[PDB]
Structure 1
Amino acid sequence: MIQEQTMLNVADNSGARRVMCIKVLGGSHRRYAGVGDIIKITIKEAIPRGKVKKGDVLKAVVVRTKKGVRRPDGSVIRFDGNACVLLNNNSEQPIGTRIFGPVTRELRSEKFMKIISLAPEVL
Protein backbone atom coordinates (compact mmCIF):
# COMPACT_ATOMS: atom_id res chain seq x y z
CA MET A 1 0.00 0.00 0.00
CA ILE A 2 2.13 2.69 -1.52
CA GLN A 3 0.30 6.03 -1.61
CA GLU A 4 1.17 9.65 -2.37
CA GLN A 5 4.21 10.75 -0.30
CA THR A 6 5.44 7.19 0.33
CA MET A 7 9.24 6.82 -0.09
CA LEU A 8 10.44 3.64 -1.80
CA ASN A 9 13.81 2.03 -2.43
CA VAL A 10 14.81 1.29 -6.01
CA ALA A 11 15.20 -2.36 -7.03
CA ASP A 12 16.86 -1.71 -10.44
CA ASN A 13 20.34 -0.17 -11.15
CA SER A 14 19.05 2.94 -12.91
CA GLY A 15 20.81 5.64 -10.85
CA ALA A 16 18.13 6.46 -8.29
CA ARG A 17 18.30 5.42 -4.64
CA ARG A 18 15.22 6.76 -2.91
CA VAL A 19 12.16 7.97 -4.73
CA MET A 20 8.80 9.39 -3.63
CA CYS A 21 5.44 8.34 -5.06
CA ILE A 22 3.31 11.30 -6.33
CA LYS A 23 0.31 9.70 -7.97
CA VAL A 24 -1.30 6.36 -7.98
CA LEU A 25 -2.38 5.98 -11.62
CA GLY A 26 -5.47 4.34 -13.13
CA GLY A 27 -8.59 5.87 -11.60
CA SER A 28 -10.23 8.85 -9.98
CA HIS A 29 -9.73 8.98 -6.17
CA ARG A 30 -7.53 5.85 -6.27
CA ARG A 31 -5.81 5.35 -2.92
CA TYR A 32 -3.19 2.62 -3.13
CA ALA A 33 -0.71 0.92 -5.33
CA GLY A 34 -0.01 -2.68 -4.44
CA VAL A 35 2.41 -4.93 -6.28
CA GLY A 36 2.46 -4.75 -10.08
CA ASP A 37 0.85 -1.31 -10.18
CA ILE A 38 2.14 1.72 -12.01
CA ILE A 39 2.85 4.92 -10.08
CA LYS A 40 4.26 8.31 -11.01
CA ILE A 41 7.38 9.14 -8.98
CA THR A 42 10.11 11.68 -8.40
CA ILE A 43 13.76 10.96 -7.70
CA LYS A 44 15.18 12.15 -4.38
CA GLU A 45 18.61 10.58 -3.72
CA ALA A 46 20.51 9.62 -6.86
CA ILE A 47 24.06 8.29 -7.25
CA PRO A 48 26.61 10.79 -8.68
CA ARG A 49 26.34 9.58 -12.29
CA GLY A 50 23.78 7.27 -13.84
CA LYS A 51 20.86 7.28 -16.26
CA VAL A 52 18.65 9.58 -14.11
CA LYS A 53 19.10 12.75 -12.06
CA LYS A 54 17.50 14.14 -8.88
CA GLY A 55 14.16 15.89 -9.60
CA ASP A 56 13.34 13.83 -12.73
CA VAL A 57 9.67 12.81 -12.82
CA LEU A 58 8.82 9.40 -14.28
CA LYS A 59 6.81 6.21 -13.83
CA ALA A 60 7.72 3.16 -11.82
CA VAL A 61 6.17 -0.17 -11.00
CA VAL A 62 5.83 -1.41 -7.44
CA VAL A 63 7.54 -4.82 -7.03
CA ARG A 64 7.78 -5.34 -3.25
CA THR A 65 5.61 -4.18 -0.32
CA LYS A 66 5.59 -4.51 3.47
CA LYS A 67 1.77 -4.97 3.53
CA GLY A 68 2.30 -7.96 1.31
CA VAL A 69 0.61 -9.69 -1.56
CA ARG A 70 -1.95 -12.48 -1.15
CA ARG A 71 -2.06 -15.78 -3.02
CA PRO A 72 -5.26 -17.71 -3.87
CA ASP A 73 -4.79 -20.29 -1.05
CA GLY A 74 -4.69 -17.55 1.69
CA SER A 75 -0.86 -17.43 1.92
CA VAL A 76 0.82 -14.03 2.25
CA ILE A 77 4.23 -12.89 1.16
CA ARG A 78 5.41 -9.85 3.09
CA PHE A 79 8.72 -8.19 2.35
CA ASP A 80 10.77 -6.00 4.70
CA GLY A 81 10.84 -2.85 2.57
CA ASN A 82 8.79 -1.15 -0.12
CA ALA A 83 10.45 -1.12 -3.61
CA CYS A 84 10.06 -0.26 -7.30
CA VAL A 85 11.57 -0.45 -10.77
CA LEU A 86 11.89 2.84 -12.71
CA LEU A 87 10.22 3.02 -16.11
CA ASN A 88 10.23 5.28 -19.15
CA ASN A 89 7.34 7.79 -19.10
CA ASN A 90 5.95 6.81 -22.54
CA SER A 91 6.98 3.29 -23.60
CA GLU A 92 6.81 2.06 -19.97
CA GLN A 93 9.77 -0.24 -20.34
CA PRO A 94 12.48 -0.46 -17.66
CA ILE A 95 15.41 1.96 -17.54
CA GLY A 96 17.55 -0.37 -15.44
CA THR A 97 19.29 -3.35 -17.05
CA ARG A 98 19.79 -5.23 -13.74
CA ILE A 99 17.37 -5.93 -10.86
CA PHE A 100 18.31 -6.37 -7.21
CA GLY A 101 16.30 -8.35 -4.70
CA PRO A 102 13.47 -10.88 -5.16
CA VAL A 103 10.13 -10.12 -6.86
CA THR A 104 6.79 -11.89 -7.34
CA ARG A 105 4.58 -13.80 -9.81
CA GLU A 106 2.05 -10.92 -9.68
CA LEU A 107 4.21 -9.19 -12.29
CA ARG A 108 4.13 -12.22 -14.66
CA SER A 109 2.32 -10.66 -17.63
CA GLU A 110 2.88 -9.46 -21.19
CA LYS A 111 3.97 -6.07 -19.88
CA PHE A 112 6.66 -6.74 -17.22
CA MET A 113 8.12 -9.93 -18.76
CA LYS A 114 11.44 -8.07 -19.15
CA ILE A 115 11.75 -7.76 -15.32
CA ILE A 116 10.97 -11.39 -14.40
CA SER A 117 13.84 -12.35 -16.71
CA LEU A 118 16.32 -10.07 -14.94
CA ALA A 119 15.19 -10.89 -11.38
CA PRO A 120 17.46 -13.10 -9.23
CA GLU A 121 14.52 -14.83 -7.54
CA VAL A 122 10.83 -14.99 -8.25
CA LEU A 123 8.87 -16.14 -5.20
Structure 2
Amino acid sequence: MIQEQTMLNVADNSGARRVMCIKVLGGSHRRYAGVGDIIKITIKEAIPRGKVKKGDVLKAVVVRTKKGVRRPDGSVIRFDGNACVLLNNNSEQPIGTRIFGPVTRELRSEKFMKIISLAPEVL
Protein backbone atom coordinates (compact mmCIF):
# COMPACT_ATOMS: atom_id res chain seq x y z
CA MET A 1 0.00 0.00 0.00
CA ILE A 2 2.48 2.53 -1.30
CA GLN A 3 1.22 5.77 -2.82
CA GLU A 4 2.60 9.06 -4.06
CA GLN A 5 4.66 10.96 -1.47
CA THR A 6 5.53 7.69 0.27
CA MET A 7 9.20 7.52 1.24
CA LEU A 8 10.84 4.12 0.80
CA ASN A 9 14.14 2.60 1.80
CA VAL A 10 16.27 1.06 -0.94
CA ALA A 11 16.95 -2.67 -0.70
CA ASP A 12 19.99 -2.55 -3.01
CA ASN A 13 23.50 -1.12 -3.19
CA SER A 14 22.75 1.26 -6.08
CA GLY A 15 23.64 4.10 -3.70
CA ALA A 16 20.27 5.71 -3.11
CA ARG A 17 19.16 5.75 0.52
CA ARG A 18 15.72 7.41 0.42
CA VAL A 19 13.37 7.62 -2.56
CA MET A 20 9.90 9.14 -2.85
CA CYS A 21 7.12 7.60 -4.93
CA ILE A 22 5.76 10.11 -7.45
CA LYS A 23 3.54 7.92 -9.66
CA VAL A 24 1.87 4.52 -9.30
CA LEU A 25 2.22 3.15 -12.81
CA GLY A 26 0.00 0.68 -14.63
CA GLY A 27 -3.53 2.00 -14.62
CA SER A 28 -5.65 5.13 -14.74
CA HIS A 29 -6.58 6.45 -11.28
CA ARG A 30 -4.56 3.61 -9.74
CA ARG A 31 -4.28 4.29 -6.02
CA TYR A 32 -1.76 1.85 -4.53
CA ALA A 33 1.36 -0.14 -5.33
CA GLY A 34 1.87 -3.48 -3.63
CA VAL A 35 4.75 -5.92 -3.62
CA GLY A 36 5.91 -6.50 -7.18
CA ASP A 37 4.32 -3.31 -8.54
CA ILE A 38 6.43 -0.91 -10.61
CA ILE A 39 6.55 2.68 -9.39
CA LYS A 40 8.13 5.88 -10.62
CA ILE A 41 10.41 7.30 -7.91
CA THR A 42 12.72 10.24 -7.32
CA ILE A 43 15.93 10.07 -5.29
CA LYS A 44 15.85 12.18 -2.12
CA GLU A 45 19.13 10.99 -0.56
CA ALA A 46 22.16 9.19 -1.94
CA ILE A 47 25.67 8.22 -0.85
CA PRO A 48 28.47 10.40 -2.23
CA ARG A 49 29.66 8.18 -5.10
CA GLY A 50 27.01 5.59 -5.97
CA LYS A 51 25.59 4.76 -9.38
CA VAL A 52 22.82 7.39 -9.04
CA LYS A 53 22.56 10.88 -7.59
CA LYS A 54 20.05 13.03 -5.76
CA GLY A 55 17.15 14.27 -7.86
CA ASP A 56 17.25 11.52 -10.48
CA VAL A 57 13.93 10.09 -11.68
CA LEU A 58 13.72 6.31 -12.10
CA LYS A 59 11.46 3.31 -11.89
CA ALA A 60 11.50 0.98 -8.89
CA VAL A 61 9.83 -2.26 -7.81
CA VAL A 62 8.33 -2.57 -4.33
CA VAL A 63 9.77 -5.55 -2.44
CA ARG A 64 8.71 -5.06 1.20
CA THR A 65 5.83 -3.23 2.84
CA LYS A 66 4.50 -2.69 6.33
CA LYS A 67 1.03 -3.60 5.07
CA GLY A 68 2.35 -6.99 3.99
CA VAL A 69 1.05 -9.55 1.54
CA ARG A 70 -1.72 -12.12 1.82
CA ARG A 71 -1.12 -15.78 0.99
CA PRO A 72 -3.59 -18.31 -0.44
CA ASP A 73 -4.33 -19.93 2.94
CA GLY A 74 -5.08 -16.52 4.46
CA SER A 75 -1.71 -16.13 6.18
CA VAL A 76 0.00 -12.74 6.11
CA ILE A 77 3.64 -11.61 5.96
CA ARG A 78 4.53 -8.13 7.19
CA PHE A 79 7.81 -6.22 7.33
CA ASP A 80 8.92 -3.40 9.59
CA GLY A 81 9.48 -1.07 6.64
CA ASN A 82 8.84 -0.22 3.02
CA ALA A 83 11.67 -0.90 0.58
CA CYS A 84 12.19 -0.93 -3.18
CA VAL A 85 14.78 -1.90 -5.78
CA LEU A 86 15.80 0.72 -8.34
CA LEU A 87 15.36 -0.18 -12.01
CA ASN A 88 16.48 1.36 -15.28
CA ASN A 89 13.75 3.52 -16.83
CA ASN A 90 13.96 1.72 -20.18
CA SER A 91 15.01 -1.88 -19.57
CA GLU A 92 13.67 -2.11 -16.00
CA GLN A 93 16.64 -4.27 -15.07
CA PRO A 94 18.14 -3.69 -11.61
CA ILE A 95 20.86 -1.09 -11.11
CA GLY A 96 22.41 -2.55 -7.97
CA THR A 97 24.57 -5.65 -7.98
CA ARG A 98 23.34 -6.99 -4.63
CA ILE A 99 20.17 -7.05 -2.56
CA PHE A 100 19.68 -6.55 1.17
CA GLY A 101 17.06 -8.02 3.47
CA PRO A 102 14.46 -10.62 2.53
CA VAL A 103 12.07 -10.53 -0.40
CA THR A 104 8.88 -12.47 -1.11
CA ARG A 105 7.80 -15.04 -3.69
CA GLU A 106 5.46 -12.52 -5.31
CA LEU A 107 8.54 -11.43 -7.27
CA ARG A 108 9.21 -15.00 -8.42
CA SER A 109 8.47 -14.20 -12.05
CA GLU A 110 10.57 -14.09 -15.20
CA LYS A 111 10.70 -10.28 -15.08
CA PHE A 112 12.44 -10.05 -11.69
CA MET A 113 14.13 -13.46 -11.48
CA LYS A 114 17.47 -11.65 -11.17
CA ILE A 115 16.34 -10.04 -7.90
CA ILE A 116 15.09 -13.39 -6.61
CA SER A 117 18.46 -14.89 -7.52
CA LEU A 118 20.37 -12.25 -5.54
CA ALA A 119 18.08 -11.94 -2.54
CA PRO A 120 19.47 -13.24 0.78
CA GLU A 121 16.15 -14.90 1.58
CA VAL A 122 12.83 -15.45 -0.17
CA LEU A 123 9.88 -15.76 2.20
- Measured against the shorter chain, the TM-score band is over 0.9
Q: Does residue 43 of structure 2 align to residue 35 of structure 1?
A: no
Say which SS state the counterpart of residue 107 (structure 2) adopts: coil
For the aligned residues, what is the CA RMSD?
A: 0.3
Aligned equivalent of 2:56: 56
TM-score (norm 2): 1.00
CA displacement, residues 41-95 of structure 1 (integer Å, 9 cap, x when unaligned): 0000100001000000000000000000000000000000000000000000000
The aligned runs of 1:1-123 (5 Å cut-off) are 1-123=1-123
Q: How many residues align?
A: 123
Distance 1:45 1:56 in 2: 10
> Which structure dedicates a bigger proportion of its chain to strand?
2
- Which stretches in structure 2 are left out of the alignment for 5+ residues? none
CA displacement, residues 1-37 of structure 1 (integer Å, 9 cap, x when unaligned): 0000000000000010000000000000000000000
TM-score (norm 1): 1.00
CA displacement, residues 77-122 of structure 1 (integer Å, 9 cap, x when unaligned): 0000000000000000000000000000000001000000000000
Show structure 1 runs of 4+ deviating over 6 A: none
Distance 1:96 1:15 in 2: 8
